[PDB]
Structure 1
């Protein structure tokens, strides 16, 4: 299937502008920083929790290996 019979669409208007009429980076920081924050707040409670737990299991288990290699008074 190629452009021409992909699907059937009715009543939709697409307006756009030549790249040479426009800025490459419209309001890049003023819109973009807020947007990136928004994006991160959205995902961090899904993504970050596991990696926290990794860091912890790795912290703990690395130091449990430390301790067990030492001597204790007995």
Structure 2
């Protein structure tokens, strides 16, 4: 079936490659890779983060409320006698 002899039909594309032993494995990290990671974080920040911030607010609120609910109310004894 699917085999490297007849996958698709292409015309007029040229490629060039070096061998691994001719070139470096980690050529430019701090001059190219770091800024690229930075933009890659920039492009997705506001699509992911705010939902989790909202989750954090909800969690803390619900915890606080549950913990208030367990403390004794002075009006339950002071009001009528």
State the TM-score, normalizing by the size of structure 2: 0.84
Shift in Å, 1:28: 1.2
Greater share of strand: 1
Distance in 1 of aligned mates of 2:30 and 2:72: 56
Counterpart of 2:15 in structure 1 is 14
Look at both structures and tell me which one has the larger radius of gyration over its CA atoms.
Answer: 2
Q: How does 1:1-74 map to 2 (within 5 A)?
A: 1-74=2-75
Distance in 2 of aligned mates of 1:18 and 1:71: 76
**Ranges in structure 2 where 5+ consecutive residues have no aligned partner:** 76-81
Matched residue count: 74
**Ranges in structure 1 where 5+ consecutive residues have no aligned partner:** none
User: Which aligned runs of 4 or more in structure 1 are off by greater than 4 angstroms?
Assistant: none
Distance in 1 of aligned mates of 2:72 and 2:16: 75
